[model samples]
Target chain A: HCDLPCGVYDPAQARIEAESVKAVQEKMAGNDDPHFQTRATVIKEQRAELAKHHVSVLWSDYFKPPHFEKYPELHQLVNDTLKAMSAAKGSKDPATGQKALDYIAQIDKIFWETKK
Target chain B: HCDLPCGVYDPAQARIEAESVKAVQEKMAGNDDPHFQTRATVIKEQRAELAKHHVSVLWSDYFKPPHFEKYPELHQLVNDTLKAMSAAKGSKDPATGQKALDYIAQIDKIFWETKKA
Candidate 1:
């Protein structure tokens, strides 16, 4: 399964969904109705899932051997973010979003660092 | 130019600079320092000029006849965005900043259109 992939990936696309993940997670507790909370959680979970998928594509496709060599923490950052998101999506915890936010910021830094 | 263009160009570069252009113009008004405002203007102007350069490059070198035939408005798309960016560099009004931003989005839309095709 380690094979050829088509097309390109941009960090902005990953960024858009990651922002949704953060926003929806933050809003989940504000709704007084359980139905609204459920809806928020559902969206948070779906958005978090998509965030993982998009971030994974960036890790796999946009980056390569040279990238990992330049940025060693890149690999673990993705993993921890994925893990952190996975942990946070099902609940209403406010602090779990930090890891995902850190992951996005760090990845954004690295993406642009090489860009500049 | 793909036959021998020498480099790959992406629309993201234009957007990045446009964002900077908007940010600097907004910040340009926040300070009372004449020196600071002057610096912001110079920076915004230079970034806008380069934005035009990069957009022009993609408009010319990256796009070809086949691309135009498929996206007919592509010509007008480029014309308006460039003109607006030129105007934006001249003024401090948020209106022109947004004018340039809207036009930038138009061209960016076209750029992605070609990518999809």
Candidate 2:
């Protein structure tokens, strides 16, 4: 019975995809099959894009001016998250994917803090 | 390079969850074990909620006034989709879950049509 804006946004959406990106990165560490790499890259990039979208939605839709005022670093944190997503997209590096997870964790921390 | 809006939204997120809802429903059809039913219900409800969230995001965040003007039924369709999600959440019935998927497909159809521009 909620209104249009259900206010039900969750960072888990993006984190789920980020976890997939990292898991795929790790799964591809030793396997050198071209077909496997190609398929895995497709899945990884897809998840990364989805993660980036969810984060962007949280930043643009969920966070308002008051949030920005309260958390001065929120804007930069989101921007950095986007960059982290880009880094994850660029290489099949687990470290790169880890960076994305780290940024999401920071955002998640702030998100829950605001919820309280 | 993209701005904060990102201009990236897809129904797949919702569809993925809807699919899981249906899958869980089917998986629970014949199982009578108490523990299995309990765990599966937890997962089904979780997926149903996520599906509803994604659909609401599309209606609120992705679909704008212009899109609504073009497709007058868009609002009603979204509302119905939310109801379908509620139905799926209420029952461990595959039919209810399938209804959710069907609604998502309709939304997805209109979504891609709008993308044609």
Candidate 3:
């Protein structure tokens, strides 16, 4: 761990995973191959797991209480992001992934606002 | 900064401030309000200042060198984000704001990938 701990953490990261989830979902939707669907399902799970992991890490490791104090909406924002991530796990609909992206964007907005 | 410096620094934070910057730009584009434009201009500066501050904070305070070593593109990514932020300042078009959003999304993708390893 470096001092001040400045490193890469952004919503784009989540979006990539969200994109992966969507891609896998699309593959599953288009394919009739049980084996392919199984693989897609597995990949989807892994991507969802990654998505949740990323969001959770940001929540636990990145965000501080002072942030919450300054912006009370942050709590809900993180909560919403996590919920969207969870909902993304099983759903094949692109909408689920889109929701996650929307929530992540919301979080990104607040993150920048804090810098002000 | 705290130990390990684990604190509030996320893409969503940047996105919110970016939205404010866009709103100011939209107001400027839609209205001939000189007074409003002046106010919007001022607000836009303030929002841009905030945007830069947030992005810089993440670049300087949140990210570590190891992260860059793992992801060489991170430097380019940060540079791109900053450029996008700077571009957002004077642009009246929604496309500019959308570009910022797109760039931020790219950064977010990398951020999540790191958590996996």
Number of the top DockQ candidate: 2
lDDT of 3 at A41: 69
Scoring only the A-chain of each prediction against the true A-chain gives TM-scores of 0.83, 0.94, 0.83
Q: Estimate, for each residue in B11-74, the C-alpha lDDT of model 3 and write its tens digit.
A: 6657666776766666567787688667666666666666666666666777788988988888
| B37-91 per-residue lDDT for model 2 (tens digits) | 8877888888799899889988988888999999999999999999999999999
Score each candidate by Cα lDDT: 0.70, 0.83, 0.68
- Per-structure clash totals for the candidates: 0, 0, 34
Candidate 1: docking tier: incorrect
Q: Docking category for candidate 2?
A: incorrect
Comparing 2 and 3 on lDDT, the stronger one: 2
| Tens-place lDDT digits, model 3, residues A29-115 | 676888776766676777778777767766666678998898888878888888887887878786887788788777778766665
Shares of reference contacts reproduced by the candidates, in order, are 0.00, 0.00, 0.00
TM-scores for the candidates: 0.50, 0.54, 0.47
Candidate 3 ranges with C-alpha deviation above 4 Å = A1-116, B1-4
> Clash pairs of candidate 1?
none
Ranking by lDDT: 2, 1, 3
lDDT of 1 by residue, A1-116 (tens): 01112122356655555566666656665666787776677777776786787778778777788889988988998788678778767656656766677777788788777766
Q: Candidate 2 chain A, which ten residues in sequence have the lowest lDDT sum?
A: A1-10
For residue A95, what is the lDDT in candidate 3?
A: 83
